[PDB]
Amino acid sequence: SPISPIETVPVKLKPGMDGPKVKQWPLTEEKIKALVEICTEMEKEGKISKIGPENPYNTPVFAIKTKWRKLVDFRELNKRTQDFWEVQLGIPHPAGLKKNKSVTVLDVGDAYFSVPLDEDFRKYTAFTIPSINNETPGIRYQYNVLPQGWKGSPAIFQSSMTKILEPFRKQNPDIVIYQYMDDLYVGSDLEIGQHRTKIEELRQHLLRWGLTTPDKKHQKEPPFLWMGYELHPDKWTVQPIVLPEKDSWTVNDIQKLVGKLNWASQIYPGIKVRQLCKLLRGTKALTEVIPLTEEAELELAENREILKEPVHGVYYDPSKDLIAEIQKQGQGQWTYQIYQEPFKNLKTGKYARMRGAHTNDVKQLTEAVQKITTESIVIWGKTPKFKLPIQKETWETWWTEYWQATWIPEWEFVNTPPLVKLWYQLEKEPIVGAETFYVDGAANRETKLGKAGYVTNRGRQKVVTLTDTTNQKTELQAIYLALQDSGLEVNIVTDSQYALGIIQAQPDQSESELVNQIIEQLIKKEKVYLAWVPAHKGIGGNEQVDKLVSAGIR
Amino acid sequence: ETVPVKLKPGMDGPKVKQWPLTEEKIKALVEICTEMEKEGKISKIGPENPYNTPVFAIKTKWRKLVDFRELNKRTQDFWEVQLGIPHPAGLKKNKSVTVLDVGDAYFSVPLDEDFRKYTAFTIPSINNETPGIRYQYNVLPQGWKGSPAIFQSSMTKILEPFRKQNPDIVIYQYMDDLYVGSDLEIGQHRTKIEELRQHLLRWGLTGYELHPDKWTVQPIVLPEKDSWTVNDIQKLVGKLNWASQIYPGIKVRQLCKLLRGTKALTEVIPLTEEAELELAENREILKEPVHGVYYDPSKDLIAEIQKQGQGQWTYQIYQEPFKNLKTGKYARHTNDVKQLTEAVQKITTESIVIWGKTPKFKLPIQKETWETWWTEYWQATWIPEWEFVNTPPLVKLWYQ
Ligand SMILES: CCOC(=O)c1c(O)c2cc(Oc3ccc(N(CC)CC)cc3)cnc2n(O)c1=O
Ligand SMILES: [Mn+2]
Ligand SMILES: [Mn+2]
């Protein structure tokens, strides 16, 4: 196995730190022997070289299982070696690769050993094979090539790999070479004749720079199993998913289920996971059987149905646009598909994330649009044209009157129920001939006790007591009361900016039940006007509820 | 030789993640940087350089923009409390101020060899097909705050003749930009700017026009109506109550007197006239600058923006919350993000003119939305600092 002639990459230790000096542990005669046989062979190949006791540094060695492997614990050296720039900031996604007629797969055998180490750093990689018991000084070696498990090996090998392929890439522009780790994906749209030719041409350029690859009779055949994917020349899919039907499900069985499902959701449309995930929250015991909830059961059943027959994805054509489609699946669940030709998906996906405490469907839709937009840019270098289950008018209204700046690139309405809508709208102006409820809440910080109630311009009144409560929860209760006792047209004046905020954002779902109760009331109404006044200022009706809720509280 | 630059002790170089870029932007950067390298301005680098700074492309000729915000924080001592460029008070008073891009001056001056590794940037690839194309600077980079600090001496030399010949013209430098102000008639100003460009041209350098003396405050505005409903006075007292926290000598006691008992909102109550006295005097105080508020050169500036609907945006600049140094507005296909980036820019350049530094922005937008879109409309050579906030429902309406 050759050692590449390429230029070395200068390495430094972290500022004001010396090399590793950890003692070598006394080894058994069996381990010592095996290490000696491994090492002399590695020295023959040029991988390591003999040094004396003039080198002051040491790094421990172990040997483990007919065949033995030599292990070197580089913890101390790694803790002392300089930081390197990230080898990769993401794996290439299959859905972003161009379609190729012919494609073959190369891999670099013994990656790190094939590439040299900075001469002035080689001395820090020193290790010692100890002699039987204490007795004599051990045989001392040091590395000449990139050692397995060292901090800088991944970055330097990759660095070297770019340099080597760069010249070849130049005079071969209509050929694409994807390289990740010690794997090479070589694709072109030439015939099976001048393809196998151009590949054996690449192999030669590689071995010229000390890089060894398999020839035609050894090189792999499609489908290519890689990173959990199944890869063909004109399609791709995830590796076979098997959902095991179980008498009982432990936490561990469920975690693995969520994982397999999440992975499959890249290409299998409609995959759901929420009810399955609901079981895992409120976490504990790994081996404890969790009985499935009825909702989890039909979710799982629905999942088996999609994973019943195999689905694949297509590759990417730069000259054609990207079309993204989103569907609402249920509360918090959203699913998407990306394609260039109607219903031939490049990839699918799902969105669920809970952003904050209280949200609505329009907010969740644009959160999904953002997430997809980012993903498209990473994968394809451009944003997709969206097709959304929301009316242009419904979107127009929301964007216009919301405090937040928002944007969606080119999108079009598509009639795929359930459609995204607002469920209620507050009034711009106070209502003529409707009861004005002045609401308020108060809670004691020690007793935790609370009172919530209203006073109205039509003389009416109410106060309720709460036990396990906070100031905020009493404000929401006050507003809730007013909703129950008002009828179909109401003006409500509060002194809680908090409560004003939640409601004005037109939420339709919440983590709070109390807020969900306020929501169900709000939709039932016809016209609600909500307004705010400063607290403790002796204002209008606010001063009257102020005396009520405070009585026996503050 | 190069002027030696160090960092603040205890903290070292920037390690900032590079944002994913679109194909067109990547191609433009690859071309820009290929040309830049063939001229020794930058050099490829190996993985032995752990440092990184984001790079972007803005606009009909594509241009490179390097987010050096992090590197600038970690060398703040150098360009400020060491080699700071002072700030003229006269600039905000001028009838006309012209901004000229002068950042091409920096390519001539070589960078300290010990420092070059901190200016490292990556050009990303689509779908991570290749690793990035790593580069570092050999000359002073555009956008690094140390570049004008060093070039100061050369810049004084260039401007010396023009300065001597026109002693009523202000030239202030902030980063890559040169701010030139005069009280001359607009035709004469543009002639002096043309003249100035000739001076820069003889050193190989190369507009967009501001009028700072016509910058008036945006007063917190009180309704001026006949027939006042209950709701309106409630609206009124709330607006004034909050104004009492910033403006010394705000009065409200006469307005409250009107609202007693649990009255209906729509019910019109005929006003007094002692309350009109407060309305008038408050209006008089609301149009004037805030008494007791002064720029503190040691504290950061904060800028807050509110969406008002119909293409309108209000904004405030302060150092101590609601203690306003300056209020204002911004009005206008056109979208929210485009409008927001335009306001941010307008406000920042106003802040540079007035104080000599950029404000820290609180943006009423989703972190992600902003980050994928902000470049599409950005035109400035600098980039200010920014947070992402939720506009309080009330603040919005208190600023009309
Ligand atoms: C058939 C039996 O063999 C197998 O079971 C088998 C493969 O087919 C295989 C194919 C590969 O090809 C690829 C090379 C590169 C990439 N990419 C990264 C650069 C993505 C473009 C993808 C696939 C890479 N590794 C493989 N390994 O490890 C296998 O064990
Ligand atoms: Mn209250
Ligand atoms: Mn109260």
PDB file of N, CA and C and ligand atoms in Angstrom, chain A residues 440-442 471 475 495 535-536 542 545-547 549-550 554, ligand 3:
ATOM      1  N   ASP A 440     -61.015  41.437  35.398  1.00  0.00           N
ATOM      2  CA  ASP A 440     -59.785  41.534  36.172  1.00  0.00           C
ATOM      3  C   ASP A 440     -59.515  40.264  36.954  1.00  0.00           C
ATOM      4  N   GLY A 441     -58.246  40.058  37.286  1.00  0.00           N
ATOM      5  CA  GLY A 441     -57.823  38.945  38.123  1.00  0.00           C
ATOM      6  C   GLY A 441     -56.795  39.382  39.149  1.00  0.00           C
ATOM      7  N   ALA A 442     -56.713  38.635  40.245  1.00  0.00           N
ATOM      8  CA  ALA A 442     -55.727  38.886  41.291  1.00  0.00           C
ATOM      9  C   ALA A 442     -55.340  37.583  41.974  1.00  0.00           C
ATOM     10  N   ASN A 471     -51.003  35.206  38.786  1.00  0.00           N
ATOM     11  CA  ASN A 471     -51.601  36.442  38.275  1.00  0.00           C
ATOM     12  C   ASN A 471     -52.087  36.325  36.839  1.00  0.00           C
ATOM     13  N   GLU A 475     -56.098  36.409  35.090  1.00  0.00           N
ATOM     14  CA  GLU A 475     -56.474  37.329  34.015  1.00  0.00           C
ATOM     15  C   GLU A 475     -57.203  36.595  32.898  1.00  0.00           C
ATOM     16  N   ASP A 495     -56.850  44.756  31.787  1.00  0.00           N
ATOM     17  CA  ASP A 495     -55.636  45.515  32.077  1.00  0.00           C
ATOM     18  C   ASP A 495     -54.410  44.613  31.984  1.00  0.00           C
ATOM     19  N   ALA A 535     -53.283  49.359  34.564  1.00  0.00           N
ATOM     20  CA  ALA A 535     -53.692  48.838  35.871  1.00  0.00           C
ATOM     21  C   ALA A 535     -53.424  49.832  37.003  1.00  0.00           C
ATOM     22  N   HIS A 536     -54.219  49.725  38.069  1.00  0.00           N
ATOM     23  CA  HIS A 536     -54.080  50.543  39.284  1.00  0.00           C
ATOM     24  C   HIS A 536     -53.993  52.047  38.999  1.00  0.00           C
ATOM     25  N   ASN A 542     -62.582  49.372  35.584  1.00  0.00           N
ATOM     26  CA  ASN A 542     -61.417  48.641  36.080  1.00  0.00           C
ATOM     27  C   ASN A 542     -61.219  48.822  37.588  1.00  0.00           C
ATOM     28  N   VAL A 545     -63.809  46.269  39.429  1.00  0.00           N
ATOM     29  CA  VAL A 545     -63.383  44.871  39.501  1.00  0.00           C
ATOM     30  C   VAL A 545     -62.116  44.764  40.336  1.00  0.00           C
ATOM     31  N   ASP A 546     -61.352  45.854  40.370  1.00  0.00           N
ATOM     32  CA  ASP A 546     -60.117  45.937  41.143  1.00  0.00           C
ATOM     33  C   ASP A 546     -60.382  45.713  42.627  1.00  0.00           C
ATOM     34  N   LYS A 547     -61.460  46.315  43.136  1.00  0.00           N
ATOM     35  CA  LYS A 547     -61.846  46.166  44.539  1.00  0.00           C
ATOM     36  C   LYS A 547     -62.369  44.755  44.825  1.00  0.00           C
ATOM     37  N   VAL A 549     -61.753  41.592  43.107  1.00  0.00           N
ATOM     38  CA  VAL A 549     -60.792  40.490  43.062  1.00  0.00           C
ATOM     39  C   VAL A 549     -59.700  40.608  44.129  1.00  0.00           C
ATOM     40  N   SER A 550     -59.436  41.837  44.566  1.00  0.00           N
ATOM     41  CA  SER A 550     -58.431  42.111  45.592  1.00  0.00           C
ATOM     42  C   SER A 550     -58.906  41.737  46.992  1.00  0.00           C
ATOM     43  N   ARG A 554     -55.120  40.803  48.230  1.00  0.00           N
ATOM     44  CA  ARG A 554     -53.996  41.741  48.250  1.00  0.00           C
ATOM     45  C   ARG A 554     -54.361  43.032  48.973  1.00  0.00           C
TER      46      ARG A 554
HETATM   47 MN    MN C   3     -56.142  44.116  39.434  1.00  0.00          MN
END
